[PDB]
Design an enzyme around this catalytic site. Structure first.
Site, PDB file in Angstrom:
ATOM      1  N   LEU A 111       2.139  -4.193   8.668  1.00 45.15           N
ATOM      2  CA  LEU A 111       0.988  -4.430   9.530  1.00 45.15           C
ATOM      3  C   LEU A 111       0.422  -5.824   9.272  1.00 45.15           C
ATOM      4  CD1 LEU A 111      -0.768  -0.969   9.326  1.00 45.15           C
ATOM      5  CD2 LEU A 111       0.347  -1.980  11.322  1.00 45.15           C
ATOM      6  N   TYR A 140      -9.472  -8.237  11.564  1.00 44.56           N
ATOM      7  CA  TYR A 140      -9.924  -9.505  12.107  1.00 44.56           C
ATOM      8  C   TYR A 140     -10.311  -9.233  13.546  1.00 44.56           C
ATOM      9  CZ  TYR A 140      -7.863 -11.766   8.024  1.00 44.56           C
ATOM     10  OH  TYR A 140      -7.542 -12.133   6.727  1.00 44.56           O
ATOM     11  N   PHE A 169       2.609   1.596   3.955  1.00 43.98           N
ATOM     12  CA  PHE A 169       2.853   0.332   4.652  1.00 43.98           C
ATOM     13  C   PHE A 169       2.518  -0.854   3.754  1.00 43.98           C
ATOM     14  CE2 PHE A 169      -1.572   1.325   5.988  1.00 43.98           C
ATOM     15  CZ  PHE A 169      -2.209   0.183   5.527  1.00 43.98           C
ATOM     16  N   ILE A 179      -6.452  -2.519   5.163  1.00 41.38           N
ATOM     17  CA  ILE A 179      -6.091  -3.879   5.535  1.00 41.38           C
ATOM     18  C   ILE A 179      -7.353  -4.574   6.009  1.00 41.38           C
ATOM     19  CG2 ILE A 179      -3.771  -3.199   6.087  1.00 41.38           C
ATOM     20  CD1 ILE A 179      -4.520  -3.325   9.020  1.00 41.38           C
ATOM     21  N   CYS A 229       1.399 -16.250   6.167  1.00 45.58           N
ATOM     22  CA  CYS A 229       2.731 -16.804   6.394  1.00 45.58           C
ATOM     23  C   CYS A 229       2.643 -18.303   6.595  1.00 45.58           C
ATOM     24  CB  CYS A 229       3.384 -16.204   7.626  1.00 45.58           C
ATOM     25  SG  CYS A 229       4.012 -14.608   7.272  1.00 45.58           S
ATOM     26  N   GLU A 257       0.686  -4.906   4.103  1.00 47.37           N
ATOM     27  CA  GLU A 257      -0.126  -5.865   4.828  1.00 47.37           C
ATOM     28  C   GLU A 257       0.524  -7.238   4.704  1.00 47.37           C
ATOM     29  OE1 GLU A 257      -4.073  -6.046   3.119  1.00 47.37           O
ATOM     30  OE2 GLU A 257      -4.904  -7.282   4.721  1.00 47.37           O
ATOM     31  N   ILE A 258       0.818  -7.881   5.832  1.00 48.65           N
ATOM     32  CA  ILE A 258       1.248  -9.277   5.806  1.00 48.65           C
ATOM     33  C   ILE A 258      -0.011 -10.108   5.842  1.00 48.65           C
ATOM     34  CG2 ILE A 258       2.687 -11.046   6.757  1.00 48.65           C
ATOM     35  CD1 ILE A 258       4.155  -8.756   5.788  1.00 48.65           C
ATOM     36  N   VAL A 259      -0.257 -10.855   4.778  1.00 47.28           N
ATOM     37  CA  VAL A 259      -1.547 -11.470   4.573  1.00 47.28           C
ATOM     38  C   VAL A 259      -1.548 -12.930   4.983  1.00 47.28           C
ATOM     39  CG1 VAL A 259      -3.283 -11.963   2.870  1.00 47.28           C
ATOM     40  CG2 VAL A 259      -2.119  -9.781   2.844  1.00 47.28           C
ATOM     41  N   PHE A 277       0.852  -1.186   0.000  1.00 51.58           N
ATOM     42  CA  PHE A 277       0.000   0.000   0.000  1.00 51.58           C
ATOM     43  C   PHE A 277       0.884   1.230   0.000  1.00 51.58           C
ATOM     44  CE2 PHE A 277      -2.885  -3.077   2.008  1.00 51.58           C
ATOM     45  CZ  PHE A 277      -4.034  -2.864   1.254  1.00 51.58           C
TER      46      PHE A 277
HETATM   47  C1  LIG Z   1       5.003 -19.169  11.622  1.00 51.48           C
HETATM   48  C2  LIG Z   1       5.780 -19.983  10.586  1.00 51.48           C
HETATM   49  C3  LIG Z   1       5.443 -19.560   9.121  1.00 51.48           C
HETATM   50  C4  LIG Z   1       7.263 -19.824  10.832  1.00 51.48           C
HETATM   51  O1  LIG Z   1       7.762 -21.115  10.958  1.00 51.48           O
HETATM   52  P1  LIG Z   1       9.296 -21.459  10.856  1.00 51.48           P
HETATM   53  O2  LIG Z   1       9.800 -21.811   9.465  1.00 51.48           O
HETATM   54  O3  LIG Z   1       9.487 -22.629  11.771  1.00 51.48           O
HETATM   55  O4  LIG Z   1      10.147 -20.233  11.490  1.00 51.48           O
HETATM   56  P2  LIG Z   1      11.644 -20.384  12.208  1.00 51.48           P
HETATM   57  O5  LIG Z   1      12.496 -19.256  11.725  1.00 51.48           O
HETATM   58  O6  LIG Z   1      12.235 -21.700  11.842  1.00 51.48           O
HETATM   59  O7  LIG Z   1      11.414 -20.328  13.796  1.00 51.48           O
HETATM   60  C5  LIG Z   1      11.122 -19.009  14.232  1.00 51.48           C
HETATM   61  C6  LIG Z   1      11.290 -19.000  15.772  1.00 51.48           C
HETATM   62  O8  LIG Z   1      10.123 -18.332  16.258  1.00 51.48           O
HETATM   63  C7  LIG Z   1       9.681 -18.983  17.428  1.00 51.48           C
HETATM   64  N1  LIG Z   1       8.275 -19.196  17.241  1.00 51.48           N
HETATM   65  C8  LIG Z   1       7.306 -18.664  18.004  1.00 51.48           C
HETATM   66  N2  LIG Z   1       6.108 -19.092  17.563  1.00 51.48           N
HETATM   67  C9  LIG Z   1       6.323 -19.904  16.505  1.00 51.48           C
HETATM   68  C10 LIG Z   1       5.473 -20.610  15.677  1.00 51.48           C
HETATM   69  N3  LIG Z   1       4.137 -20.571  15.841  1.00 51.48           N
HETATM   70  N4  LIG Z   1       5.991 -21.353  14.699  1.00 51.48           N
HETATM   71  C11 LIG Z   1       7.334 -21.384  14.544  1.00 51.48           C
HETATM   72  N5  LIG Z   1       8.189 -20.721  15.298  1.00 51.48           N
HETATM   73  C12 LIG Z   1       7.704 -19.971  16.296  1.00 51.48           C
HETATM   74  C13 LIG Z   1      10.386 -20.337  17.614  1.00 51.48           C
HETATM   75  O9  LIG Z   1      11.180 -20.417  18.839  1.00 51.48           O
HETATM   76  C14 LIG Z   1      11.252 -20.410  16.366  1.00 51.48           C
HETATM   77  O10 LIG Z   1      12.557 -20.999  16.571  1.00 51.48           O
HETATM   78  P3  LIG Z   1      13.784 -20.232  17.255  1.00 51.48           P
HETATM   79  O11 LIG Z   1      13.287 -19.116  18.168  1.00 51.48           O
HETATM   80  O12 LIG Z   1      14.733 -19.674  16.209  1.00 51.48           O
HETATM   81  O13 LIG Z   1      14.579 -21.204  18.100  1.00 51.48           O
HETATM   82  C15 LIG Z   1       5.437 -21.475  10.743  1.00 51.48           C
HETATM   83  O14 LIG Z   1       5.418 -21.802  12.120  1.00 51.48           O
HETATM   84  C16 LIG Z   1       4.086 -21.830  10.158  1.00 51.48           C
HETATM   85  O15 LIG Z   1       4.046 -22.264   9.032  1.00 51.48           O
HETATM   86  N6  LIG Z   1       2.979 -21.692  10.873  1.00 51.48           N
HETATM   87  C17 LIG Z   1       1.656 -22.061  10.311  1.00 51.48           C
HETATM   88  C18 LIG Z   1       0.952 -20.818   9.733  1.00 51.48           C
HETATM   89  C19 LIG Z   1       1.195 -19.629  10.620  1.00 51.48           C
HETATM   90  O16 LIG Z   1       1.382 -19.854  11.808  1.00 51.48           O
HETATM   91  N7  LIG Z   1       1.208 -18.412  10.068  1.00 51.48           N
HETATM   92  C20 LIG Z   1       1.439 -17.212  10.861  1.00 51.48           C
HETATM   93  C21 LIG Z   1       0.215 -16.260  10.814  1.00 51.48           C
HETATM   94  S1  LIG Z   1      -0.429 -15.948   9.099  1.00 51.48           S
HETATM   95  C22 LIG Z   1      -0.638 -14.198   8.978  1.00 51.48           C
HETATM   96  O17 LIG Z   1       0.258 -13.538   8.513  1.00 51.48           O
HETATM   97  C23 LIG Z   1      -1.931 -13.566   9.465  1.00 51.48           C
HETATM   98  C24 LIG Z   1      -3.311 -14.175   9.009  1.00 51.48           C
HETATM   99  C25 LIG Z   1      -4.474 -13.478   9.717  1.00 51.48           C
HETATM  100  C26 LIG Z   1      -4.875 -14.051  11.059  1.00 51.48           C
HETATM  101  O18 LIG Z   1      -4.208 -14.945  11.568  1.00 51.48           O
HETATM  102  O19 LIG Z   1      -5.920 -13.587  11.638  1.00 51.48           O
END
Ligand SMILES: CC(C)(COP(=O)(O)OP(=O)(O)OC[C@H]1O[C@@H](n2cnc3c(N)ncnc32)[C@H](O)[C@@H]1OP(=O)(O)O)[C@@H](O)C(=O)NCCC(=O)NCCSC(=O)CCCC(=O)O
Ligand SMILES: CC(C)(COP(=O)(O)OP(=O)(O)OC[C@H]1O[C@@H](n2cnc3c(N)ncnc32)[C@H](O)[C@@H]1OP(=O)(O)O)[C@@H](O)C(=O)NCCC(=O)NCCSC(=O)CCCC(=O)O
Ligand SMILES: CC(C)(COP(=O)(O)OP(=O)(O)OC[C@H]1O[C@@H](n2cnc3c(N)ncnc32)[C@H](O)[C@@H]1OP(=O)(O)O)[C@@H](O)C(=O)NCCC(=O)NCCSC(=O)CCCC(=O)O
Ligand SMILES: CC(C)(COP(=O)(O)OP(=O)(O)OC[C@H]1O[C@@H](n2cnc3c(N)ncnc32)[C@H](O)[C@@H]1OP(=O)(O)O)[C@@H](O)C(=O)NCCC(=O)NCCSC(=O)CCCC(=O)O
Ligand SMILES: CC(C)(COP(=O)(O)OP(=O)(O)OC[C@H]1O[C@@H](n2cnc3c(N)ncnc32)[C@H](O)[C@@H]1OP(=O)(O)O)[C@@H](O)C(=O)NCCC(=O)NCCSC(=O)CCCC(=O)O
Ligand SMILES: CC(C)(COP(=O)(O)OP(=O)(O)OC[C@H]1O[C@@H](n2cnc3c(N)ncnc32)[C@H](O)[C@@H]1OP(=O)(O)O)[C@@H](O)C(=O)NCCC(=O)NCCSC(=O)CCCC(=O)O
Ligand SMILES: CC(C)(COP(=O)(O)OP(=O)(O)OC[C@H]1O[C@@H](n2cnc3c(N)ncnc32)[C@H](O)[C@@H]1OP(=O)(O)O)[C@@H](O)C(=O)NCCC(=O)NCCSC(=O)CCCC(=O)O
Ligand SMILES: CC(C)(COP(=O)(O)OP(=O)(O)OC[C@H]1O[C@@H](n2cnc3c(N)ncnc32)[C@H](O)[C@@H]1OP(=O)(O)O)[C@@H](O)C(=O)NCCC(=O)NCCSC(=O)CCCC(=O)O
EC number: 2.3.1.48
Lengths: 161, 163, 161, 162, 161, 163, 163, 162
Positions: free
Chosen positions: E110, E144, E72, E141, E78, E74-76, E67
């Site tokens: 954001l 939620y 800014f 944005i 992950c 929007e992180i949509v 935007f």
């Molecule tokens: C969050 C991620 C994408 C990151 O995973 P990753 O590759 O393991 O990241 P990393 O660098 O290896 O570790 C980062 C570090 O962050 C810490 N951490 C705290 N909470 C978490 C968590 N829930 N998951 C993974 N890690 C998490 C952990 O301690 C991780 O390891 P570390 O601190 O380095 O020892 C992954 O866990 C995942 O795929 N999660 C499932 C989907 C998700 O959780 N998405 C995040 C929200 S989506 C969004 O942007 C908003 C949508 C709207 C809404 O939700 O309302």
């Protein structure tokens, strides 16, 4: 150096010298076939070649001819330059070729192996049990008589690379 | 004399070539008397028919009319003749050999043709054979059929020079 | 909501695009041991078509197939109805539309492979293990699977209207 | 009066358009169990051509066909002569014209289907139930009318038919 | 395993398949999100996506919407696929997104985060105190009910990769 | 000894201007060493940043790199530097003035800048103030924020001639 | 004389428009003689500024210079003047009534102005208020806040015929 | 009979034009104490859109709106359906279509100044008096009629409204 695979052909200098590179490697490793023959087939539009490149330089490749109208792919030339054999290059070459073909939804290789080669084609998964009707490939696959026909069947589930 | 070979054909996209094709229709029709002259000329001047012409002193003295089927993987030998006062000099085999070379260069290695009794001998000496490896399902309906003539086939060797 | 049937595919349209992803989701969700990538590659292949079953703008099922006029049959690649709408006859209507679509396109033979979890549904759709299509015609054209049962269906030609 | 043949079709003239309608009429009438519109979509299909038989300006007969040159044959779709012009040789001349036409395009095989009511005509035009052509060459192309004998006709390009 | 990053979107087949790959990884990792919503945004043209590509296949991404007019992004979405999590891939994806957003004159992120995602965003230098005015993000944005609004401020004088 | 002012910037430029931009990036980089020279570089050649270059005998001796945000109603001051052997001669004020006059002619009337501890009295003496009348909503996330630096503002009068 | 209203400005002129603009530049500066003629001229001919001219017998006898800020939803009244031989005749109130009607038709419902001490009476009679409903964030910076001058606002109703 | 919806407006095509005039009638007739001049000037203003409800050719209702994409919301300006087709879900189907239209155009906030007779309807349509959109964002972009009730509706882009 950097190792790279390019699927290249004649429809650019870098590709052209690679094609001469390949034609040099095919003529030199497969001496039993006229260099004029290898040149036409390499530089033909309908023929493609998977080129293995070590640091700018061709050292191996596979020349093939896809028959998507027929279901299969003919393997024409396979060489790896003499100072690069038996380091598993030919296998990496076949696998990239396999991956390339599953991405293009073609699941049978057909090739005529010479006695010296059959062992390597086994080790790539080729069998003597030719499941393709002779009517499907006769006349399309360049029928070396005496050389031994073999088949390979790909599984589009496996990642070959 | 001076002797030249030339793959010519009626293009849908020249005049030497035109008079050259006419001369071939005159040779084919006169050496192949049981082929109606109109039928020969239709085929010769058809686009998807090519014609290797044998030229001695600018004058057509023989040739082969053929039809390639690269999708099917074989060529139909349609007509061939050498004019009457030039036969039995080897011109017929030089035409065949050249025709074989052109066909390696175009990645086709199969010749189909029908022969009456009187041509069968010639084709054996060009290395045709009565045994036909090509599937009926591949040539039928694309080659001008001839009930009552032998189907001959020839297999070419890409590793070989014919000319 | 009102039900819609559409035969769609990648053309080599925003609404068709998201429908193809919708299909890629109910296919990849209901066939869970198949690579997501593979299903996606095929759904978006230009030479494959997919009969999509639409209820309220949203995808609830469909049949991914691949026609072979040169060979007189159609290969059926994926069939899934989404879970919250299965055993409602939706699968049968999809199959019945497919049959209608193919009669009009002068293809009267379906070939499919059936795992044990799905073979009954195909029997109930008029499929049999009795493969009348010559093996000559389908090898190298249908994805040969080992361990699965090849099933055939023969359509009944109809003079439309 | 004047008799006159033309290979007509719907490509991408008022004369040709009404000619086609007459052909759809004559076809649909002489083939009463055929749905009129199925006849219509075919006559007006671009990939279908029709050999029209005009007599003193007016469609009295025709043969609707689809050529499949990449497969070496033509499908015969509709033949008909209007009833007060039948049994005069019009049918045969329509066929012999369609043959001459196809010699000239180097398609040398006809395929068609023959119900009870018209197989005798087709045999008098040299159709055989022996099908020389590979079932692999037409199975996905021609409309199958199951319950009607498939018949083939092979043409000799060396003979005149006109 | 050749890893590689790419900022891609919908305006090429592999890019198309790449977005399908992304829409998949998103649905499966964020189950409470409707699959069709995820696809509608991923294949929306004002939405870009930073694809993480291990050895040819998607194994992670961030769907974001820029935007500029508002100053800014929007992180949509992950996600990192299940087998590849807790290897650093998630943090590397944020850092590349941060560098892209430095070289583009945008220094504010954001996002809405549910309670399971708040931990991850804090680790990436996100905070619950939002300095951007509501007047600037609200109605631009997608908000939620009940997710925390998390903010991130970037330093254009830093290398992030 | 001939001293010129020119508003230049990277048009999305000829060699004289390109070399000037480089000379500006040189000067900004030396008189502002805690600024990454790759950041200065990227900003100066940004097509939405402009630069008021002070030139003497064709040679860049100072400038003010700025960013006009006309939709937001102000301009950001990005970099301010006179080369070292030209300072304390009144160049930095003439630069500010020429920039002040430039903007009232472009109906922009607010300057915003961040000033570290060591630059604040310069801007004070050029009319800037720590009291910001512009609302935080108007500039936040549009000017480059420098935590620990004092945001300064300047209000220009369009009824005044600055140069 | 035949009276006429015309919304004119310097586009990106017409020699009858261009002489009207100087006619206005004259009337504005002469009626507002403690603002530099240059500042008046720059604005009247600024292209983001339009002027509603009052044409009596072909000569100019007054006008309202204004600036539409659609993105912000308000127009700024910047100059108002009627020739001296034509004041207290209803001309300033017709000029304002037309300005209002024009803005309704362009979907703009707020006028802002900074009135000096001597104008305030007139603006009140045109229904202007010191009570400002538009948030500061919308106008600040866009319209110039002269020290000692009174921001006044006017809220238009689109269901009203103004002219 | 046949019922269709059409987002229409004046672009700065006669069946559209007659359709706009139909709307200007219906609005003006359901909202009698609003100057018809004003209603018309809006309906035909180009920055304004109108979602039309066509039943058997004839315009039976619609919603005149104004998208403020820069400001992030859409103004609802007029809602009417013909006197003899109310209380059948028409006005609710109209708003549902307007909701879907705005989801695809990623504008997820409606604002309206409601009269006392309207308020019930907008509430069933999910409007409320709790305005999340900062005053600065809508103030002056929409006329604040004295006596009228500012109402708001947030749209959920993951829900299917149609
Ligand atoms: C969050 C991620 C994408 C990151 O995973 P990753 O590759 O393991 O990241 P990393 O660098 O290896 O570790 C980062 C570090 O962050 C810490 N951490 C705290 N909470 C978490 C968590 N829930 N998951 C993974 N890690 C998490 C952990 O301690 C991780 O390891 P570390 O601190 O380095 O020892 C992954 O866990 C995942 O795929 N999660 C499932 C989907 C998700 O959780 N998405 C995040 C929200 S989506 C969004 O942007 C908003 C949508 C709207 C809404 O939700 O309302
Ligand atoms: C065979 C290749 C192409 C492969 O080279 P490579 O890199 O050494 O293969 P690798 O991955 O390192 O080893 C794979 C494995 O294959 C096995 N193998 C069995 N027989 C052979 C053999 N004759 N040559 C090479 N490898 C052979 C070896 O044991 C290798 O190791 P492994 O046992 O798996 O641990 C190479 O050695 C070469 O260029 N040889 C000479 C050219 C040749 O003979 N090509 C085959 C015919 S090409 C064709 O398509 C037909 C032309 C017409 C005709 O032949 O009639
Ligand atoms: C066949 C040719 C064209 C060859 O003429 P040529 O230059 O004299 O041949 P050459 O190289 O000098 O000698 C070849 C050698 O072939 C031997 N031979 C055995 N049988 C025959 C035979 N029937 N005809 C010609 N030669 C024949 C002769 O003894 C020759 O000497 P050699 O054995 O090598 O010592 C000539 O004799 C000729 O004009 N023949 C009449 C045209 C003809 O019938 N052509 C072939 C049929 S056209 C076709 O493609 C088939 C149409 C479909 C159908 O017919 O049903
Ligand atoms: C199988 C379908 C697609 C059909 O769904 P549907 O809407 O429930 O069908 P319906 O008309 O309502 O039911 C008609 C009839 O189907 C019968 N049935 C017998 N076996 C099964 C079975 N295994 N699954 C579902 N139904 C089955 C049910 O009893 C029904 O009986 P009924 O006629 O109503 O008395 C659906 O259930 C589904 O998505 N299931 C899970 C995924 C699956 O396994 N799909 C079929 C495999 S895909 C395939 O084999 C194509 C090639 C794949 C490959 O090459 O490997
Ligand atoms: C069959 C035709 C088209 C022929 O017209 P025509 O002028 O009578 O032909 P002709 O040259 O004068 O007579 C030559 C000869 O045909 C013999 N014949 C034997 N059986 C029949 C028969 N069933 N119908 C017509 N003629 C028949 C007559 O005895 C004549 O014998 P002859 O020449 O004296 O030895 C005509 O009778 C007709 O219009 N019939 C009604 C339409 C019809 O039957 N069309 C052919 C059906 S196939 C078709 O077009 C639909 C697609 C296939 C499907 O529906 O599945
Ligand atoms: C500040 C300038 C650019 C101007 O110098 P100049 O040509 O000598 O100007 P002048 O007309 O002769 O005025 C000299 C006059 O300014 C007074 N002064 C009070 N405080 C300062 C101060 N901190 N630095 C320089 N001069 C200062 C001196 O006492 C002089 O008194 P005067 O007005 O002559 O009676 C120059 O001294 C210089 O090269 N400084 C080094 C770079 C610098 O600090 N630039 C200003 C900050 S860059 C920016 O825009 C902010 C980026 C973000 C951030 O800072 O975080
Ligand atoms: C203000 C006008 C344009 C209006 O004159 P007009 O054509 O005679 O208008 P009208 O319809 O006949 O008068 C209607 C009514 O306006 C009333 N009024 C109340 N206060 C004043 C006042 N201070 N000056 C002029 N008139 C004033 C008059 O008494 C009239 O009758 P009323 O009292 O209502 O019964 C005229 O007096 C004039 O040209 N004066 C010289 C220029 C001037 O002072 N214009 C006012 C705008 S100030 C400006 O544009 C710059 C401020 C920006 C800044 O630097 O901050
Ligand atoms: C309000 C509508 C447009 C609704 O169309 P509809 O088909 O009748 O509504 P529906 O789909 O059947 O839903 C009916 C349902 O809504 C409930 N309801 C509660 N209060 C009301 C109410 N005051 N009017 C209509 N319905 C109302 C009724 O109990 C019905 O119950 P239900 O939900 O069906 O169980 C209609 O009644 C109508 O055309 N009324 C006359 C014009 C009007 O009042 N329009 C709305 C005012 S918008 C406007 O421009 C007002 C001034 C704004 C300004 O200041 O600019």
């Amino acid at each position: 150096g950097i190792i790279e695979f390019h699927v290249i052909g004649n429809s650019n200098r870098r590709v052209l010298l690679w094609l001469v590179g390949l034609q040099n490697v095919f003529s030199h490793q497969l001496p039993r076939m006229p260099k004029e023959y290898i040149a036409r087939l390499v530089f033909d539009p309908k023929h493609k070649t998977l080129a293995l490149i070590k640091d700018g330089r061709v050292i191996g490749g596979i020349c093939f001819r896809m028959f998507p109208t027929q279901g299969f792919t003919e393997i024409v030339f396979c060489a790896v330059t003499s100072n690069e054999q038996v380091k598993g290059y030919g296998t990496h070459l076949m696998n990239h070729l396999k991956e390339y073909h599953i991405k293009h939804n073609i699941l049978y290789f057909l090739t005529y192996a010479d006695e010296y080669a059959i062992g390597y084609f086994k080790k790539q998964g080729f069998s003597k049990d030719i499941k393709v009707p002779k009517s499907r490939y006769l006349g399309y696959i360049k029928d070396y008589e005496g050389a031994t026909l073999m088949e390979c069947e790909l599984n589009p589930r496996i990642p070959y690379t």
